[PDB]
């Protein structure tokens, strides 16, 4: 429209209908010029990397992008409480995105003194990758999200991507992408941008914990009509061999026949937060579970979903097998345990093997009169028919969706870090300040212009997501576990601003409070 008109309004609320929740978030952003308007080849060579496991090849772009892919972008802590205490499930449905009130600014420096002024004719350009033709970086859990607290102003992160490498080198199959080779909308102050998106059908996240365990599903009062082998010897001494059979029943539940078995396992090393209980060695990398791809070792960072500890063992956690969030102000490198927050998957204990335990035991031989029966431990167990499992829980600090990789086959493509896997996730939204040349020379020169006006932009972003709810139908008589604030006096309010103005999230909050039968 024009210089003097606002191109959009602040809309931050949430709206609870019967089976639907509509979250709306507005934030203020700032976009720098990245890479001096250049595309740059980057690799572990350009960054000085060494180990082959860390080698990479790729490109950094002048562009930047929006990430709303964490839940605290869309939910206040109160809204999150309201979701998790009342609902068995939820999934995203629709998306609405807006860019408005764009302001492009010019920075001039004289001597040690900078002046900022509006550049009214400068433009910002924006496009969504709707055909998913770019490397999709939103499914890796990155910084640069919209801030959880609506009054914070955030920097837009720089877009970059990786392609195939051999060491620091690239192969011929490596692909380079110019983001200028897409059509994009150009925006002066007074222009706005919007688009809508439909989430594809995704199952409801399970926001409940089971009130039954998979090995306890029997009627405790009644025998089975099945028999098991109770006794193989008639007693001490030579040549005592029998087959004795007993009814499996209430008194021996471990031996009863069952129709369903716990889900798959890939075993994690167990680490105690009580520190003297740990070995006196460096096992962090060496003792870690990992998978290998093309000679590279990638740590298996989230487990396949697994229970983080056994009952009462809460001090234990799987080495890499859980999500670790930092507290507010926690540094980058080598921080103590009290400065991070270790998620635990304890609720899926009912259907899922413990991350730090063997799946079970198998027979390793044929017994005989000569040979005793031998068993061995199953350290990793793939899918078996009859397995049943829960996915990893999702968190207010955590990711929402991932892009399912485009491949011939996948199994149960729920993202291992948690959330909703999608073949066509919310598309990437790319934004860039268009370069404005400084004064060119008065004689022609064929070289590309390397001299530009120093410039940055700011504005507002609205994200509106419609969420579908699955209500609790339970007949449970006794009251349930719910997420609560604690009444006891404290210097600060949890999930509130500091005395210095710093918003913090004191604890990770999962979704699983309400219960269901198994």
Q: Of residues 183-212, which lie at the interface with a copy of itself (CB under 8 A)?
A: 183-191
Q: 53 touches which of ligand GAL, a copy of itself, none (CB within 5 to 8 A by kind)?
A: ligand GAL
Closest CA to 420 of 219, 199, 215, 218: 199
In the complex, the smallest distance separating the C-beta of residue 173 from a copy of itself, rounded to whole angstroms, is: 13
Q: Is 389 annotated as a binding residue?
A: no
Q: Where are the beta strands (DSSP E) in 356-440?
A: 360-363, 375-378, 380-381, 387-388, 401-403, 420-422, 428-433
513 SS3 class: coil
Q: Of residues 115-154, which lie at the interface with a copy of itself (CB under 8 A)?
A: 120-123, 125
Select 53 or 180, whichever has its Cβ closest to a copy of itself: 180
In the complex, the smallest distance separating the C-beta of residue 299 from ligand GAL, rounded to whole angstroms, is: 7
In the complex, the smallest distance separating the C-beta of residue 455 from a copy of itself, rounded to whole angstroms, is: 12
Beta-bridge mates of residue 25: 463
In the complex, the smallest distance separating the C-beta of residue 140 from ligand GAL, rounded to whole angstroms, is: 17
Which stretches of the chain bind ligand GAL, using CB under 6 A? 51, 53, 285
Q: What DSSP string describes 63-120?
A: EEEEB--BHHHH--HHHHHHHHHHEEEEEEEEEEEEEEEEEEEEEEESSS-EEEEE-T
In the complex, the smallest distance separating the C-beta of residue 51 from ligand GAL, rounded to whole angstroms, is: 6
Comparing every residue's Cβ against ligand GAL, the nearest one is: 285
Q: 33 touches which of ligand GAL, a copy of itself, none (CB within 5 to 8 A by kind)?
A: a copy of itself
Select 188 or 327, whichever has its Cβ closest to a copy of itself: 188
Enter the DSSP assignment of 254.
Answer: T
Select 9 or 279, whichever has its Cβ closest to ligand GAL: 279
Terminus-to-terminus CA distance in the chain, angstroms?
A: 58
In the complex, the smallest distance separating the C-beta of residue 100 from a copy of itself, rounded to whole angstroms, is: 8
Kindly report the length of the chain: 518
- 291's enclosing H/E stretch is strand 290-293
Select 103 or 168, whichever has its Cβ closest to ligand GAL: 168
Closest CA to 389 of 363, 422, 411: 411
* Strand bridging mode 401-403 / 420-422: parallel
Binding piece for a copy of itself, criterion CB under 8 A, among 22-30, 145-153, 203-211, 296-304 = 22-30
Buried b (16+ CB within 10 A) or exposed e, 120-135: eebbbbbbbbeeeebb
Enter the DSSP assignment of 392.
Answer: P
Select 52 or 240, whichever has its Cβ closest to ligand GAL: 52
Closest CA to 390 of 207, 236, 122, 142: 207
Q: Is 347 annotated as a binding residue?
A: yes
Binding piece for a copy of itself, criterion CB under 8 A, among 38-46, 180-188, 205-213, 459-467 = 180-188
Size of site (CB under 8 A) for a copy of itself: 54
Q: Which two tokens stand for residue 174?
A: 């490596």
- 10 lies in the binding site for a copy of itself (CB under 8 A): yes
| Residue 178: Cβ within 10 Å count | 9
469 SS3 class: strand
28-32-37-38 Cα dihedral, nearest 10 degrees: -100
Closest CA to 423 of 400, 411, 405, 399: 405
Select 18 or 331, whichever has its Cβ closest to ligand GAL: 331
Task: Give how far the C-alpha of residue 163 lies from the chain's centroid of Cα atoms, to the nearest Å.
Answer: 22
Q: Of residues 81-100, which lie at the interface with a copy of itself (CB under 8 A)?
A: 85-86
Q: Is 344 annotated as a binding residue?
A: yes
Q: 436 touches which of a copy of itself, ligand GAL, none (CB within 5 to 8 A by kind)?
A: a copy of itself
In the complex, the smallest distance separating the C-beta of residue 136 from a copy of itself, rounded to whole angstroms, is: 17
Q: What DSSP string describes 194-236?
A: EEEEEPPP-PPEE-EEESS-TT--S-TTS--S-EEEEES-SSS
Q: 289 touches which of a copy of itself, ligand GAL, none (CB within 5 to 8 A by kind)?
A: none
In the complex, the smallest distance separating the C-beta of residue 194 from a copy of itself, rounded to whole angstroms, is: 15
Q: In this chain, which of 386, 412, 437, 493 binds a copy of itself, going by CB under 8 A?
A: 437
Q: In this chain, which of 217, 229, 363, 449 binds a copy of itself, going by CB under 8 A?
A: 449
- 4 lies in the binding site for a copy of itself (CB under 8 A): yes
Select 85 or 230, whichever has its Cβ closest to a copy of itself: 85
| Positions in the binding site for a copy of itself (CB under 8 A) | 1-6, 8-13, 18, 24, 26, 28, 30-34, 36, 76, 85-86, 101, 103, 120-123, 125, 178, 180-191, 434-437, 439-442, 449
What residues are designated binding site? Answer: 252, 285, 344, 347
What residues are designated binding site for beta-D-galactose? Answer: 252, 285
């Amino acid at each position: 429209d024009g210089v003097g008109s606002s191109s959009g309004n602040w809309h931050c609320d949430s709206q609870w209908l019967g089976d639907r929740v509509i979250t709306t978030s507005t934030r203020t952003w700032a976009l720098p010029t990245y890479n001096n308007h250049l595309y740059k080849q980057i690799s572990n060579s350009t960054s000085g990397g060494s180990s082959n496991d860390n080698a990479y090849f790729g490109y950094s772009t002048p562009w930047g992008y929006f990430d709303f892919n964490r839940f605290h972008c869309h939910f206040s802590p109160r809204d999150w409480q309201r979701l998790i205490n009342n609902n068995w499930g939820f999934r995203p449905k629709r998306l609405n995105f807006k860019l408005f009130n764009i302001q492009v600014k010019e920075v001039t420096d004289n001597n040690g003194v900078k002046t900022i002024a509006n550049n009214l004719t400068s433009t910002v350009q924006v496009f969504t990758d709707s055909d998913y033709q770019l490397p999709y970086v939103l499914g890796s859990a990155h910084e640069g999200c919209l801030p959880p607290f609506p009054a914070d102003v955030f920097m837009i992160p720089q877009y970059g991507y990786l392609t195939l490498n051999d060491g620091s080198q690239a192969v011929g199959r490596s692909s380079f992408y110019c983001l200028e080779y897409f059509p994009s909308q150009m925006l002066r102050t007074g222009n706005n941008f919007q688009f809508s998106y439909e989430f594809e059908n995704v199952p409801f996240h399970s926001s409940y914990a089971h009130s039954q365990s998979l090995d306890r599903l029997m009627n405790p009062l009644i025998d089975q009509y099945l028999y098991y082998l109770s006794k193989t010897i008639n007693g001490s001494g030579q040549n005592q061999q029998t087959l004795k059979f007993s009814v499996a029943g209430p008194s021996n539940m471990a031996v009863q026949g069952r129709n369903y078995i716990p889900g798959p396992s890939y075993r994690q090393q167990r680490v105690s937060t009580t520190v003297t209980q740990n070995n006196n060695s460096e096992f962090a990398w060496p003792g870690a579970s990992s998978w290998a791809l093309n000679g590279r070792n990638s740590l298996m960072n989230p487990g396949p979903a697994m229970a983080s500890h056994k009952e009462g063992e809460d001090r234990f956690f799987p080495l890499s097998g859980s999500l670790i969030f930092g507290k507010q102000g926690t540094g980058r490198d080598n921080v103590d345990a009290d400065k991070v927050m270790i998620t635990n998957e304890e609720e899926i204990k009912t259907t899922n093997p413990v991350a730090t335990e063997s799946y079970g035991q198998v027979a390793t031989n044929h017994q005989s009169a000569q040979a005793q029966a031998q068993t061995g431990w199953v350290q990793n167990q793939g899918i078996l028919p009859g397995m049943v499992w829960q996915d990893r829980d999702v968190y207010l600090q955590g990711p929402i969706w991932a892009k399912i990789p485009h491949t011939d086959g996948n199994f149960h493509p729920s993202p291992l870090m948690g959330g909703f896997g999608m073949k066509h996730p919310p598309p990437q939204i790319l934004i860039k300040n268009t370069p404005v040349p400084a004064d060119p020379p008065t004689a022609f020169n064929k070289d590309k212009l390397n001299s530009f006006i120093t410039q940055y932009s700011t504005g507002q972003v609205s994200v509106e997501i419609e969420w579908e709810l699955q209500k609790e139908n339970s007949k449970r008589w006794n009251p349930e576990i719910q997420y609560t604030s604690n009444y006891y006096k404290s210097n600060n309010v949890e999930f509130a601003v500091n005395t210095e103005g710093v918003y913090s999230e004191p604890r990770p909050i999962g979704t699983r409070y309400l219960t269901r039968n198994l």
